[PDB]
Design an enzyme around this catalytic site. Structure first.
Site, PDB file in Angstrom:
ATOM      1  N   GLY A 186     -38.028  59.876  56.232  1.00  0.00           N
ATOM      2  CA  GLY A 186     -37.381  60.599  57.496  1.00  0.00           C
ATOM      3  C   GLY A 186     -35.936  61.037  57.400  1.00  0.00           C
ATOM      4  N   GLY A 216     -33.173  64.871  53.109  1.00  0.00           N
ATOM      5  CA  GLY A 216     -32.432  66.142  53.413  1.00  0.00           C
ATOM      6  C   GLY A 216     -31.064  66.253  54.269  1.00  0.00           C
TER       7      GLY A 216
END
Ligand code: CA
Length: 223
Positions: free
Chosen positions: A175, A178
């Site tokens: 989660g 990125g």
């Protein structure tokens, strides 16, 4: 983020949440129209959410802007995660302010030992699962390439670096992918992968942003 702390609302102004009906990855705002994230976070129909703290409550400083184009690195390999980086262009320019701001790209690569800030809305448990609503932060040092390679035999390329704590307990996690690794005000890494989360001798692995600055700049200049 496992073993971190609550950042505080809008204290990491370049942190974005990529949303496709729900938060699924982090990203970093690098100018009013572009976001840097991990190539393994690619999907169509992305809405970039800026100015977020609690991702489940509209608090007043958000800017939701749909992506107009995504560009996965030309050499991204999804099996090895080599070149785990992508650029996302916004359909409209974000309105930059104190709570929604870009983060500078590096001019040179960082060194082992430098302390950085890693952030995201990922899992906060190393065993089990618990997803936070507010942004979590972790201060962690970049580890030597030799210790990184020793921790993950045959898996660390020149486009990756490790950061964290070999003793375990403090790391990024599912989660957070990125999201940013910022050191001395420069975006040096992108949350990429790791064996489980916060496991002993298995530090976090991050995309080495300094190797991509020329590609990022030329891509933005022509898109
Ligand atoms: Ca919110």
């Amino acid at each position: 983020i496992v073993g971190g702390y609550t950042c505080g609302a809008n204290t990491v102004p370049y942190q974005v949440s990529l949303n496709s009906g729900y938060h699924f990855c982090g990203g970093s705002l690098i100018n009013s129209q572009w976001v840097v994230s991990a190539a393994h976070c690619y999907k169509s129909g992305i809405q970039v959410r800026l100015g977020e703290d609690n991702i489940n409550v509209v608090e007043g400083n958000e800017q939701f802007i749909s992506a107009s184009k995504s560009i996965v690195h030309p050499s991204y390999n999804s099996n090895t995660l080599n070149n785990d980086i992508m650029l996302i262009k916004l359909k409209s320019a974000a309105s930059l302010n104190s709570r929604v701001a870009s983060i500078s790209l590096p001019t040179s690569c960082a060194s082992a030992g430098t302390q950085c800030l890693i952030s995201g809305w990922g899992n906060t448990k190393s065993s089990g699962t618990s997803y936070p609503d507010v942004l979590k932060c972790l201060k962690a040092p970049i580890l030597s390439d030799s210790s990184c390679k020793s921790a993950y035999p045959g898996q660390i390329t020149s486009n990756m670096f490790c950061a964290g704590y070999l003793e375990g307990g403090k790391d990024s996690c599912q989660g957070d992918s990125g999201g940013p690794v910022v050191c001395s005000g420069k975006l040096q890494g992108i949350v990429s992968w790791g064996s489980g989360c916060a496991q002993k001798n298995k530090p976090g692995v991050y995309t080495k942003v300094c190797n991509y600055v020329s590609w990022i700049k030329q891509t933005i200049a022509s898109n």
